[PDB]
Amino acid sequence: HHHHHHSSGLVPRGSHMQSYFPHQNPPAQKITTTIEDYYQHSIQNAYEGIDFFWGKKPKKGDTLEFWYGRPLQIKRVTFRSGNAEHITDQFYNTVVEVLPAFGDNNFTTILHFDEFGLADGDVEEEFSLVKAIRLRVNADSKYWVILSEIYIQTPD
Ligand SMILES: CC(=O)N[C@@H]1[C@@H](O)[C@H](O)[C@@H](CO)O[C@H]1O
């Protein structure tokens, strides 16, 4: 019988900097997460360019997955965590992994969230034609989590 901590008593923001960086990403067949979202800041909204994702504390084993209906060619991946209003709310101890369309029937790590809370890089050619992209959390966090940018950049 846990006591819900009410947070919809709204306050002036601490920072006036941009909270979210939308992109048109390739259409996903399925988007899943095991992380509870907050204040309707859904992972689908973040992927689809509507608003930032805000999740509760990640736990070891949590995933956020983007599945594609046909092999998808990707050039770069960016997941930007935290934002200026919530610099603590990063993905810690989390990988970005891809499931290649052909070549490996399991996910392979392509990026880590760095000391800025950013997982960003060019995708090597062997991982560039994908079935799915996901985040996988390797440890419990003390903090909630924000994704302020998701950009799955194609080579076109
Ligand atoms: C609405 C809000 O302030 N959400 C925060 C979150 O940013 C933070 O990481 C978490 C744990 O300290 O506590 C929540 O209340």
**Å from CA of 7 to ligand 1 middle:** 9
Phi (first) and psi of residue 35, to 5 degrees:
-90, 125
Ligand 1 binding pocket mutation candidate from 144, 145, 147, 148 (most atoms within 8 A of CB): 144
Terminal Cα distance for the chain, rounded: 52
Instruction: Judge contact between 129 and 26, C-beta under 8 A.
Output: no
Method: X-ray
**Å from CA of 15 to ligand 1 middle:** 15
The DSSP result for 6-22, as a single string, is ---S----S--S-----
**Å from CA of 130 to ligand 1 middle:** 34
Q: Which atom of ligand 1 is nearest to the CA of 39?
A: 1
Which residues have CB under 8 Å from 134's CB, separation 6+? 63, 64, 65, 66, 96, 97, 98, 99, 107
What is the architecture of the domain spanning 30-153? Answer: Sandwich (2.60)
Report the alpha-carbon distance of residue 32 to residue 78 in Å, rounded.
Answer: 18
Structure tokens at 117: 């809370």
Query: How many residues belong to the chain?
Result: 156
Report the alpha-carbon distance of residue 87 to residue 117 in Å, rounded.
Answer: 9
Resolution in Å, one decimal, please: 1.1
Look-up: residue for tokens 């000391």? 115
Instruction: Judge contact between 118 and 12, C-beta under 8 A.
Output: no
Show me where the domains of the chain are located. Answer: 30-153
Report the alpha-carbon distance of residue 65 to residue 51 in Å, rounded.
Answer: 18
Report the alpha-carbon distance of residue 79 to residue 63 in Å, rounded.
Answer: 14
CA 47-52-55 angle, 5° bins? 95
Query: Which SS3 state, helix, strand or coil, does residue 127 take?
Result: helix
